[PDB]
Amino acid sequence: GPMGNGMNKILPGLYIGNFKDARDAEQLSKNKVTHILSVHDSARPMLEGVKYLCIPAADSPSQNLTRHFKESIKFIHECRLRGESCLVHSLAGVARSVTLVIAYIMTVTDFGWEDALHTVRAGRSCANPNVGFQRQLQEFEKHEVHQYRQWLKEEY
Numbered sequence: 001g002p003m004g005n006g007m008n009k010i011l012p013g014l015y016i017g018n019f020k021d022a023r024d025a026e027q028l029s030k031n032k033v034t035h036i037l038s039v040h041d042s043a044r045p046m047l048e049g050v051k052y053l054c055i056p057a058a059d060s061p062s063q064n065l066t067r068h069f070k071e072s073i074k075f076i077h078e079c080r081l082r083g084e085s086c087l088v089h090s091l092a093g094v095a096r097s098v099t100l101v102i103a104y105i106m107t108v109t110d111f112g113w114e115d116a117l118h119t120v121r122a123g124r125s126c127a128n129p130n131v132g133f134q135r136q137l138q139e140f141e142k143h144e145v146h147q148y149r150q151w152l153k154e155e156y
Contacts, residue, residue, distance in 0.1 A: 007089070
């Protein structure tokens with residue numbers, strides 16, 4: 001459905017879900033989630049046992065997410081390098097969270113944004129960033145993802 005059917009594994013240690021999944025103790029335990037990147041209107045730390053990165057942002061083409069790619073990638077990558085699991089969630093798990101995960105996949109592979117979206121959709125079929133987020137991902141691919149790949153190599 002339009003908000004998914006529970007949080008979904010995208011890659012080892014990387015999940016996308018909706019706001020309800022992000023408070024679901026059974027899902028968080030089953031998936032060993034210890035880091036939550038919360039990107040939605042009212043994002044703030046809630047639960048115990050979880051390291052948070054909170055990005056207040058709207059699901060609108062007027063919302064800039066590119067300025068949050070670097071911090072999001074650092075947060076996800078350092079969690080995954082330690083063998084831990086990160087949930088990226090928005091309200092629906094469809095746009096804001098998906099866009100940050102696409103940027104991550106693009107930085108840890110050779111993929112452009114469309115192949116990264118295909119990867120996300122294989123795990124979470126409802127993924128569908130708005131056209132504004134799509135244009136931000138396209139600019140990222142043509143002008144900056146190569147810088148981020150080099151930063152990732154130099155840092156880790």
